[PDB]
Amino acid sequence: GFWSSVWDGAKNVGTAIIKNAKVCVYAVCVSHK
Structure with missing residues (x-):
């Protein structure tokens, strides 16, 4: 399905991307919003 x-x-x-690319912050010491 x-x-x-x-x-x-x-x-x-997604959770995986951060699991290995766990940067200081959510994205990369910055904000996408």
């Missing part, structure tokens, strides 16, 4: 792999896949995809 795409609608299912979209929330589960992304959730793990």
Whole structure:
């Protein structure tokens, strides 16, 4: 299910990026907003 792999896949995809690229702050010592 795409609608299912979209929330589960992304959730793990993003959380992972930070898991290894855990910068001082959320993004990179800055804010995207």
